[PDB]
Design an enzyme around this catalytic site. Structure first.
Site, PDB file in Angstrom:
ATOM      1  N   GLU A 156       6.417  -2.502  -1.741  1.00  0.00           N
ATOM      2  CA  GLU A 156       6.738  -1.327  -0.937  1.00  0.00           C
ATOM      3  C   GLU A 156       8.251  -1.072  -0.900  1.00  0.00           C
ATOM      4  OE1 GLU A 156       4.427   0.948   0.022  1.00  0.00           O
ATOM      5  OE2 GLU A 156       2.888  -0.219  -1.026  1.00  0.00           O
TER       6      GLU A 156
ATOM      7  N   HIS B 272     -12.022   7.270  -2.766  1.00  0.00           N
ATOM      8  CA  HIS B 272     -11.228   8.252  -3.490  1.00  0.00           C
ATOM      9  C   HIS B 272     -12.076   9.446  -3.899  1.00  0.00           C
ATOM     10  CE1 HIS B 272      -9.252   4.385  -3.676  1.00  0.00           C
ATOM     11  NE2 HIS B 272      -8.121   4.953  -4.056  1.00  0.00           N
TER      12      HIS B 272
END
Ligand SMILES: *[C@@H]1O[C@H](CO)[C@@H](O[C@@H]2O[C@H](CO)[C@@H](O[C@@H]3O[C@H](CO)[C@@H](O)[C@H](O)[C@@H]3O)[C@H](O)[C@H]2NC(C)=O)[C@H](O)[C@H]1NC(C)=O
Ligand SMILES: *[C@@H]1O[C@H](CO)[C@@H](O[C@@H]2O[C@H](CO)[C@@H](O[C@@H]3O[C@H](CO)[C@@H](O)[C@H](O)[C@@H]3O)[C@H](O)[C@H]2NC(C)=O)[C@H](O)[C@H]1NC(C)=O
Ligand code: NAG
Ligand code: NAG
Ligand code: NAG
Ligand code: NAG
Lengths: 194, 598
Positions: free
Chosen positions: B359, B489
């Site tokens: 991240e 998704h």
């Protein structure tokens, strides 16, 4: 033989948004840039044209103190020759500059959660600012090929935008107060000493 | 001295970039305040700020379609004007666009709140998360896994089917009204490039290259498959055929998207000490701040800057006590005007250490292209950010690195075995998901094109699972089903191919960076730490935003303008040749017609 009002400029309650930068005639008085150079809180304390500690031992005909606010990313432009957005549309220094440029954080007092949209810049102008010029015109920009009669519409923008100042901004997008001490010294009666 | 259409358009975008950074900072601070301190109050603020920003986008979009790209000869401008002029969902009529949104939302809540109750207690139920998912990841009882699988797909799927049908109808209308042939063609636009002589790329060139690279992946996959079927057969003797496809419910999660949990059942050399420095980290008294400090150090180590003071002051790096509640999902926030944050409920673990490097690599990318004008502050294409994040955790998880940071002991012996163990886990994760991903998105691309009629939607689906993936459904599913839509998704309208292309880029990069680092040995051991030539090579593409064509962006790192599986293959080649040995006695590939129920 009485100190030159400097707090009145540096610690003044509010500052002018750069497009309408104001200017105090520092004259007929004796200056305390001697012990204010050590105030020691300057993110950018750069004199462009005269030694920093010895501006005491030379008297000048008329010191001019300009004060305004900008974002850190813009401070780089308050410098001779530099042409960003602000040094050509808001406040331009002559390439033969000989004064001082002093700048400190203001996030604490000039910024506010919720955006302090009280300080503004120019972003649109037909032509570059001549040195030390001011423009406080709110005439609508003519970006298009069609007439805008105080229209604010297509290809016609209000020339003045405001900095959305907020405390959680990054150090480059944080408000910075600034003072530019133009030291001029000509045949005119010199009365600013130290 | 009249104004040219391009001059007007520059001034237009000029006014737009500042109005935009302010309104976007509004929305994003609102969102961070909701995701770190959930108060109906902060729900209300997030929605009001998001609303104003949506309305401003719609309004500047309608304003910008008055400056025609045809009369504009400046790729940066043309990029912004084209980005700004997509009217997307607005090109539909109001009644239809209202319908579309009601449907999208209905599907998403049906997924998040889908629950299945056991056949003996109609009040005691499980939602996908965290019940069913937990069964599918841990269990070794065949019938429990089968029940989780069939019931999740028959309670939730059978609801999504009509919604998904109408969702395809409307999305297709919208993409055709946005001048695309079908909705799949629209999702493929992300990779489009005109007008950059030698860096151009058209949308159909994406289907070609995806299929071409998958052809060269197929050998590795077929061997991973042969070996995993061998080991699963040793774990479920009377259920798996040594020439069949793998039963869809025995793969390690609710769909078989990642074969990562099958490691316990397919570990080459178990006795070997796997690597997990969790214990070292407790023992040196590492707290979150440490984790992220070591991440900062790693990035600095390669000529990249250290997090902003803003970053540290404002990020949320630990779970904020049980006195306030927050969404715990690593998020790398680029709020603008210098404000970069990370949000993660960090635990002093190994998984979280590797995640923090990931991240923070996001944040690094966000800072690099901050200078870029607003509509260009983004990864080169949908695949770039997550690839950049992945290669950091790659460098960060190697033993060379773990030793240097003192979480591993110089008296740790790497050998063939532990490294095959590592590479096999890596392949169960990376290589496994590849055919899965190519397949799912090929099925949607066809659905949208119209090549697969509704009367054969599931039929065609499970043909492809068998043919491409080498996976077989353990129950025959009629058209009342909608197994595609049972994965997040799919039922939440996210393009999926970005995972295939991310996976291939990330190796194209690492290989390039390790060459820049003068690494010796196999590519999977490489740690780019302490190599400014590597950070510099990377940075020269980071800084770009999406202001240059993703082909040139890629060539900036790897010296080639297009995707390439060869670095994938090379990363895994030790595991390849060990698999090929291990599959002398085995049948490699699969017959499409076996199944557990016939
Ligand atoms: C498309 O139009 C844009 C907007 O005019 C062009 O961006 C401009 O690019 C030139 C050349 O690289 C820049 O000139 C220099 O930029 C620096 C920035 O720090 C400045 O310090 C120099 O004195 C000089 O002005 C120009 O600033 C830049 N403008 C903006 C607003 O970024 C771009 O080059 C055009 N693209 C093509 C292909 O023509
Ligand atoms: C979505 O974006 C498109 C493309 O930017 C917008 O383009 C619009 O296209 C229509 C139809 O061609 C234009 O209307 C007029 O139609 C007549 C007869 O066909 C024509 O001869 C006129 O010169 C004109 O093209 C419309 O002006 C044009 N509008 C813009 C802003 O480009 C479309 O409007 C957008 N759709 C929605 C629903 O907002
Ligand atoms: C949460 O949100 C409200 C509104 O922004 C704020 O007043 C409050 O102090 C925040 N903190 C906690 C812990 O709830
Ligand atoms: C980042 O690195 C530089 C290296 O010279 C250092 O001076 C600085 O204090 C470091 N920390 C931050 C928060 O920038
Ligand atoms: C990077 O170099 C420093 C100083 O020589 C060293 O202490 C650190 O362990 C190195 N990290 C590596 C080689 O991963
Ligand atoms: C480990 O490497 C040596 C190198 O000569 C090789 O002979 C040996 O067979 C390898 N072991 C395995 C399990 O591959």
């Amino acid at each position: 033989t009485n100190l030159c009002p400097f707090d009145e400029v540096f610690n003044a309650t509010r500052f002018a948004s750069v497009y309408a930068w104001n200017r105090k005639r520092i004259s007929n008085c004796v200056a305390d840039y001697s012990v204010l150079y050590n105030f020691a809180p300057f993110f950018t304390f750069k004199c462009y044209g005269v030694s920093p500690t010895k501006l005491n031992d030379l008297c000048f005909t008329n010191v001019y103190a300009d004060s305004f606010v900008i974002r850190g990313n813009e401070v780089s432009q308050i410098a001779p020759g530099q042409t960003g957005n602000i040094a050509d549309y808001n406040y331009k220094l002559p390439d033969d500059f000989t004064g001082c440029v002093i700048a400190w954080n203001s996030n604490k007092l000039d910024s506010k959660v919720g955006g302090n949209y009280n300080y503004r810049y120019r972003l649109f102008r037909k032509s570059n600012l001549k040195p030390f010029e001011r423009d406080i015109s709110t005439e609508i920009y003519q970006a298009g090929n069609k007439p805008c009669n105080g229209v604010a519409g297509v290809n016609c923008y209000f020339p003045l935008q405001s900095y959305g100042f907020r405390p959680t901004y990054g150090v480059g997008h944080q408000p910075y107060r600034v003072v530019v001490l133009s030291f001029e010294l000509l045949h005119a009666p010199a009365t600013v000493c130290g | 001295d009249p104004s040219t259409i391009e001059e007007q358009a520059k001034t237009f975008l000029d006014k737009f970039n500042h109005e935009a950074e302010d309104l976007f900072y509004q929305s994003s601070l609102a969102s961070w305040n909701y995701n770190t301190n959930i108060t109906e109050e902060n729900v209300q603020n997030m929605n009001n700020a998001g609303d104003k920003w949506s309305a401003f986008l719609k309004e500047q979009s309608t304003l910008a379609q008055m400056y025609p790209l045809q009369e504009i000869q400046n790729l940066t401008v043309k990029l912004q004007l084209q980005a700004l002029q997509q009217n997307g969902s607005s090109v539909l009529s109001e009644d239809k666009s209202k319908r579309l949104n009601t449907i999208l939302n209905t599907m998403s809540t049906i997924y998040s709140t889908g629950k299945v109750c056991n056949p003996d207690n109609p009040q005691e139920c499980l939602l996908l998360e965290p019940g069913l998912n937990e069964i599918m990841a841990n269990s070794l009882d065949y019938n429990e896994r089968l029940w989780a699988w069939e019931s999740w797909r028959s309670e939730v799927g059978k609801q999504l089917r009509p919604l998904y049908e109408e969702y395809v109808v409307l999305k297709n209308e919208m993409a055709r009204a946005n001048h695309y042939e079908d909705y799949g063609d629209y999702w493929r636009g992300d990779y489009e490039v005109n007008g950059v002589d030698g860096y151009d790329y058209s949308r159909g060139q994406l289907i070609e290259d995806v299929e071409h690279t998958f052809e060269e992946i197929k050998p590795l996959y077929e061997h991973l498959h042969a070996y995993v079927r061998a080991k699963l057969m040793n774990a479920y003797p009377s259920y798996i055929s040594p020439i069949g496809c793998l039963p869809a419910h025995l793969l390690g999660d609710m769909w078989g998207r990642f074969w990562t949990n099958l490691y316990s059942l397919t570990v080459p050399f178990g006795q070997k000490p796997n690597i997990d420095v969790t214990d070292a980290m407790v023992d040196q008294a590492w707290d979150a701040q440490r984790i992220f400090k070591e991440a900062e150090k790693f990035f600095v180590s390669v000529g990249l800057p250290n997090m902003t003071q803003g970053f540290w002051e404002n990020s949320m790096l630990t779970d904020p006590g049980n006195v306030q509640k927050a969404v715990c999902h690593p998020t790398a926030w680029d709020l603008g005007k210098g404000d970069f944050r990370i949000l993660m409920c960090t635990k002093v673990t190994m998984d979280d250490f590797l995640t923090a490097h990931h991240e923070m690599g996001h944040i690094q990318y966000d800072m690099a292209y901050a200078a870029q004008p607003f509509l260009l502050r983004n990864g080169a294409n949908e695949g770039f950010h997550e690839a950049v994040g992945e290669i950091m955790s790659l460098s960060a998880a190697t033993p060379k690195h773990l030793k240097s940071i003192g979480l591993l002991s110089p008296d740790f012996q790497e050998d063939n075995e532990t490294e095959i163990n590592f590479l096999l886990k890596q392949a169960l994760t990376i290589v496994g998901t590849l055919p899965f991903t190519y397949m799912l998105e090929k099925w949607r691309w066809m659905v949208f094109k119209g090549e697969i009629p509704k009367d054969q939607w599931m039929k065609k689906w499970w043909e492809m699972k068998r043919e491409i993936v080498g996976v077989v459904e353990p129950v025959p599913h009629d058209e009342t089903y909608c197994d595609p839509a049972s994965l997040f998704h799919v039922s939440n309208d996210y393009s999926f191919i970005r995972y295939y292309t991310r996976t291939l880029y990330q190796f194209q990069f690492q290989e390039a960076l390790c060459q820049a680092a003068k690494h010796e040995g196999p590519l999977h051991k490489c740690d780019i730490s302490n190599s400014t030539e590597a950070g510099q090579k990377l940075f020269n593409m980071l800084r770009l935003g999406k202001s240059e064509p993703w082909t040139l962006a890629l060539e900036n790192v790897v010296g080639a303008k297009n995707m390439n599986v060869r670095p994938l293959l090379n990363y895994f080649e030790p595991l390849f040749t060990w698999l090929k040995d291990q599959n002398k006695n085995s049948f490699v590939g699969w017959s499409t017609d076996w199944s557990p129920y016939a």
